[PDB]
């Protein structure tokens, strides 16, 4: 699904650009909304974004460490980016997201 592709590309971008791999669901969603705004496509709300990240979690691509609140849950990537790039199979899009440093 396209929203799962955008979520995986923003997670790969935030993991590449930042030394601190403590990514929260809210800190990821705030970048994902800016990426969807620059792609000129409608973004999901946080209540749907949490279910989208939970559906990506079933594939084993991620692991969510639960916390007291849904915004505070910690996404943790469990594939290397060289596997994530071959899994997304949309290199023209990942080349656009990973060259989009200004939206972080």
């Amino acid at each position: 699904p396209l929203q799962q592709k955008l979520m995986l590309c923003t997670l790969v971008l935030m993991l590449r650009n930042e030394r601190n791999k403590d990514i929260s669901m809210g800190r990821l969603h705030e970048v994902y909304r800016r990426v969807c705004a620059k792609r000129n496509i409608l973004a999901l709300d946080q209540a749907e974004f949490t279910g989208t990240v939970d559906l990506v979690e079933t594939r084993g691509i991620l692991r969510i460490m639960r916390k007291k609140e849904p915004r505070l849950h910690k996404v943790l990537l469990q594939w290397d980016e060289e596997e994530v790039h071959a899994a997304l199979s949309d290199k023209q899009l990942i080349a656009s997201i990973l060259s989009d440093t200004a939206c972080l």
Binding site: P1, H29, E30, L44, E57, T58, R59, E69
Partner: protein, 401 residues
Amino acid sequence: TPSQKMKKIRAGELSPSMQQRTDLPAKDSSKSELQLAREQLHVSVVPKSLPCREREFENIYAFLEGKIQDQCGGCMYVSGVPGTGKTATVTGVIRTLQRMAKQNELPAFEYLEINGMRLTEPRQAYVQIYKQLTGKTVSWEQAHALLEKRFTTPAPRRVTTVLLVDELDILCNRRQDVVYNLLDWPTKSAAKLVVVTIANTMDLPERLLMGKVTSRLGLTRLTFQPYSHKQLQEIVTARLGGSETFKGEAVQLVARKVAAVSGDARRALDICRRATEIADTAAVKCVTMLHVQQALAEMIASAKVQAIRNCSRMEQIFLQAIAAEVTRTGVEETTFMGVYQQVETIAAFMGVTFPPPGRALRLCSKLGAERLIISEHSRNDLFQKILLNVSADDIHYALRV
């Protein structure tokens, strides 16, 4: 006396009836065509032959037919994201096998089934499997002992038994005794059990099952991929029949905006029903594309900007000052004291007075009950921590445009 009722219930000798309607259900011929599409589009109406799941049907059918005809037993693990036609395909394969065994083209077989979320405890599956055999309700220890006496001991003429197990991850727990028994019974030669296990996560045997349980679960596996842009259109146009009550672009927009989110088929069959209900109140008989756009905007809702615009003016000043303190201090978690100081600054700018802090705690409690912000219990005032739950740009989008 109640004890005779409970004994007749636990012995299974009274069927659990439900009360019937006083009035008869309405006849089919009085229905409108749009109502006929609304009832064909219900998610409970499983088709007799599922569109776009033929390959998985051949896979589960070849596995179950080989395990039944060889009289050997074994296990399978099917998995996939919810709404992708797992349980419907497995029950369709089992109904096809029962229709074939009824005509003596196949050996006869028993079909037990359980579900891991209908059980309060993992061990209660022992109560239920035995309840699909004898029909008696007994304690789980006696049921486990009778199930071991049934499966470990060769008793011709034993018939093949297929134990479908939905919701396998709920049955796990720490000891993993129940799933070990359910996967260890097929390995014995005396039991002809063929257990199929449905679950969501692809990596479940490696993620949370033990090494011997994963070794018993085997390497035969099947994954139900999410429905694409096209398969979701084929499903809904199969549900509608030959009716033209839905525009083809409307079904195409439903499928295009549902497959981009999840690939769930229940979301498409619910959005099409809501589009039918929206077209019904407009007194049109065709579901034109703007009815689908309204149903999509309703069922993929994003109503937080409406909540910030509908807040009282002091709550809007509070929502501005929390984001102002987040921008000022940098860290995302703010104490109530600096939030109140920024509140006094913004209220001095706008000219309205602000309520004293005992009423500002009532405003913070209202925003924390509405989940616009995350906030602690109010007993530790001025030092309670106030996370902002809504994004900071949504507040300016609500209070500017």
